[PDB]
Design a binder for these strands. Structure first.
Ligand code: MG
Ligand code: MG
Length: 476
RNA sequence: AUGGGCC
RNA sequence: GGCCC
């Protein structure tokens, strides 16, 4: 978004730490073009004269402003999408109890007991268990006091910046393109869950093309559902954004929140108010305090669902800004945050749509880059969604999420000390869809050192997961 | 080092 | 704990 202020405060918030990721035996063998993200300025792998802390805020280039006519247009799309959405989810969106916000419900995971609390708790050595009782689902004085404030709508907060200790393409490491997480205070997360926790549960349970969202899906078993759905259309588009999160303009955010979370849909009046506190935020990084306008704080605030809803409304608004008579049935789409798959039988011109996404401050481009702009005819077996391809399992005939072996190799070449065993059994679950031969190759560097799940066991597990009867069929 | 999914 | 946004 738009960085309006850049002040320097005396007290300092720490981030620059060492990476917990370490090279495994696989690394020496596979030799991936991947590595831990740069977390320091003194990182020897960084390109000369490349200032880390400067490349982290280079995503905030502007809070694009919309005219009155586009705003009224956007509002129309938001209300149309809100309509479909709640039409499918229902309208039992009353607040959750504090107990229910902490433990969650069906469709909603409980809160994480041992993660960061945000500010200003980080300036007091307090963990999450020190503020909240994740057992009995209870909160302490500070929190409760903070809840009243939020009830009063007089709550003020700041985001704590964290560099993401993940593996990335070496090109992005060297370019110091480490991604960051805007850790919000723990009370904010909780209150958000109270205000919109039921809604999020419903979204997770109802994931699919109908609501245009994959949040809460399980690739292993939903690829079949999503795959058959999309192979059903003439055109399919793998659309990429750049800085989706950052490029949400206040206009757009403010209109979605107003349109999707109205009290008539069952929401407590504070739902709209809490979300709106994500627009203009103050971000604390070491000795720096940075006030930003526009953009959704990445990681802490039903971030995925908000990013997904917006994505749906962006597509409907672009199409409508270019074509006449466009409705939600004109096309079909599933998204997960910024990740998106769009499909239609009309020769929709996504090359012409670019400017219209620009009118929102968003930059769309084809996934398959080598191709000059968006083409037509592409089928679902060409796109990526959630870093997985849609391939046909020749054993069952079901679609299966296949990850690129280069990616898998990367994942297997770095690990957090003392978790290699768990991680493997975890990655095996993903590798099984590559096939027997690839599966063997991938884990070969680990054989005789860890327990590698057999291809057969994970395969049988999958077949049942995806379609229990298909398993029974193989027995009749 | 996180929101949220999925194991 | 691990992956995916
Ligand atoms: Mg502004
Ligand atoms: Mg994609």
């Amino acid at each position: 978004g738009l960085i309006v202020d850049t002040r320097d405060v005396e007290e300092r918030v720490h981030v620059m730490r060492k990476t917990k990721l370490a090279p495994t035996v696989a690394h020496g063998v596979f030799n991936p073009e991947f590595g831990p993200a740069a977390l320091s300025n003194k990182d020897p792998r960084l390109n000369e004269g490349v200032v880390l802390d400067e490349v982290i805020f280079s995503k905030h280039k502007s809070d694009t402003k919309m005219s009155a006519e586009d705003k009224a247009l956007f509002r129309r799309c938001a209300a149309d999408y809100a309509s479909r959405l709640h039409s499918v989810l229902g309208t039992a969106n009353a607040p959750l109890s504090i107990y229910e916000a902490i433990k969650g419900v069906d469709g909603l995971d409980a809160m994480e007991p041992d993660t960061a609390p945000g500010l200003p708790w980080a300036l007091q050595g307090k963990r999450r268990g020190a503020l909240i009782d994740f057992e009995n689902g209870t909160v302490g004085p500070e929190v409760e006091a903070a809840l009243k404030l939020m009830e009063k709508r007089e709550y003020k907060f700041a985001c704590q910046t964290f560099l993401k200790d993940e593996i990335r393409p070496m090109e992005k490491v060297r370019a110091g393109k480490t991604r960051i997480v805007d850790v919000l205070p723990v009370e904010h997360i909780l209150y958000t869950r109270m205000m919109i926790g039921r809604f999020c549960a419903q979204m997770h349970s109802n994931n699919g093309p109908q609501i245009g969202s994959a949040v809460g899906c399980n690739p292993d078993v939903d690829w079949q559902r999503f795959g058959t759905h999309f192979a059903q259309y003439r055109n399919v588009w793998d659309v990429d954004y750049s800085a989706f999160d950052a490029n949400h303009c206040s206009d757009a955010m403010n209109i979605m929140f107003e349109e999707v979370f109205r009290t008539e849909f069952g929401f407590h009046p504070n739902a709209e108010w809490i979300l709106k506190t994500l627009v203009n935020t103050e971000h604390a990084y070491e000795n720096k305090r940075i006030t930003v306008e526009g953009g959704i704080p990445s990681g802490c605030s039903a971030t995925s669902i908000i990013n997904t809803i917006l994505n749906n409304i962006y597509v409907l608004y672009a199409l409508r800004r270019h074509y006449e008579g466009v409705e939600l049935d004109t096309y079909t789409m599933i998204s997960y945050g910024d990740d998106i798959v769009v499909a239609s039988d009309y020769d929709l011109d996504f090359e012409a749509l670019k400017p219209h996404f620009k009118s929102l401050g968003q930059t769309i481009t084809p996934a398959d880059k080598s191709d000059k702009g968006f083409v037509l005819g592409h089928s679902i077996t060409d796109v990526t969604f959630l870093k997985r391809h849609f391939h046909m399992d020749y054993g069952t005939g079901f679609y299966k999420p296949v990850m690129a072996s280069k990616t898998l190799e990367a994942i297997l070449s770095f690990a957090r000390r003392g978790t290699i065993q768990e991680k493997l059994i975890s990655v095996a679950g993903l590798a099984v869809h590559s096939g027997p031969d690839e599966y063997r190759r991938l884990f070969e560097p680990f054989q005789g050192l860890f327990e590698i799940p057999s291809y057969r066991s994970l395969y049988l597990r999958w077949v049942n997961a995806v379609c229990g009867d298909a398993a029974a069929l193989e027995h009749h």
